[PDB]
Assembly symmetry: D2
Homo-oligomer: 115 residues x 4
Amino acid sequence: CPLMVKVLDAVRGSPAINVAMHVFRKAADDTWEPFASGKTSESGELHGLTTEEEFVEGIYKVEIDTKSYWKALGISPFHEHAEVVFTANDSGPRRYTIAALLSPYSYSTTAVVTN
Amino acid sequence: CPLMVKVLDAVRGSPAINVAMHVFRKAADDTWEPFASGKTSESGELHGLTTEEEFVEGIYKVEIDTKSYWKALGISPFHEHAEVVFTANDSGPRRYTIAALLSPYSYSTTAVVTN
Amino acid sequence: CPLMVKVLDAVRGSPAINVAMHVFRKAADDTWEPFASGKTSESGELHGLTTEEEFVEGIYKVEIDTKSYWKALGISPFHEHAEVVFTANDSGPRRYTIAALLSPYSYSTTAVVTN
Amino acid sequence: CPLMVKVLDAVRGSPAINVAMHVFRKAADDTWEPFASGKTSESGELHGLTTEEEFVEGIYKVEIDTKSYWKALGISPFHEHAEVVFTANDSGPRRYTIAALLSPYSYSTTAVVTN
Ligand SMILES: CCc1oc2c(Cl)ccc(Cl)c2c1C(=O)c1cc(I)c(O)c(I)c1
Ligand SMILES: CCc1oc2c(Cl)ccc(Cl)c2c1C(=O)c1cc(I)c(O)c(I)c1
């Protein structure tokens, strides 16, 4: 699993469950081609988005539907979505975890890139 | 000033100076139209992007060029940019401060919205 | 003003108003001695804690009463308080802004240090 | 495992390895009794601190030696340590993960409390 996403909820102190997201890959014409998508599990995680073979170098965008998450909780959110845009680069075997910690008016995001 | 941005550096504990950013507004045809742009000052702040009359209701995107910031400091960061996308002025005019705290592999972002 | 604190609310997207905090300084006997205290204003800021002459080198602790903040909003938060402990003025006098962004189960804290 | 700690590094985008920490429990005389300690693994995690039987309600402090971590990396840090102080409360079976994301001049911390 070369690319995984983890989402946590800073209001409830829990995994953010059933958070939908779409992953896009930047095309030569600078448009965002849909690449993969899913919803987070009960652990706030989304696995199995891509494979080693297809996860080639390039610019990728993860668009996390945080607005729908907060709306389902009855809490007014600020952002339309949380977007994480990064370049994936071949420097040895790399596994990427994109993590986001969500609050209604704020979010934090980090990457855990390992071998 | 109804739309201001502030950027801090979490490595040096300082304002993030000379950070370029572009603001877009979603058009009726669903494309992102250019709205305003600028760079942060010595205080890490960017003021004067718009006016109360021009800053109508809509969905706005602030694209903060964090990559160029880190690269000029010798650092190859994870993110291509920090994106902040939000609906503004849906309940009447408000003043928005978009803030981002930057590290090479992570950033946090929040908003301060006043009436 | 060499020591200022700013506190924001990540749920409401606003300053965190009326947040009490106590500042301590580590004594030569290694106990925490009271140094200054106050509460945040309508802007979420606390100024006037000390002076350049009084704010000598040393290890300082800012104890931010986040629990009382959340409880007054009806929320039972995770943390008892937010603690920020740092050495100040070790290379000569500096100006410090201690910032905290609060959510019920999470907070971020940073420092802005200027010469 | 009722209490676990996870530490990540926002400069290198990796688990924070070999980070030492001590856990304290508040005593009746308001002093901090040493309770448990350890160093994070290659995954940035510390398990096996306590057991269900001894992890009773009370106020607990996790003191994370972030200063030694950054010093070992040759990077000048702001904080003496990162402290996380919380009340553990019996509301059904609860597992606590205390997580911290570290930068030299800033850190974020959250709790993931589950059943
Ligand atoms: C969404 C995950 C996450 O994102 C963070 C950001 Cl962005 C800032 C600070 C923190 Cl602490 C976190 C954080 C975690 O708490 C976390 C991470 C992993 I990997 C994990 O297995 C568990 I359990 C918890
Ligand atoms: C409490 C202030 C604060 O703390 C943060 C943390 Cl800890 C992480 C990320 C962010 Cl973006 C912030 C943040 C701000 O938004 C901020 C800071 C300053 I100085 C400021 O003048 C204004 I306006 C806004």
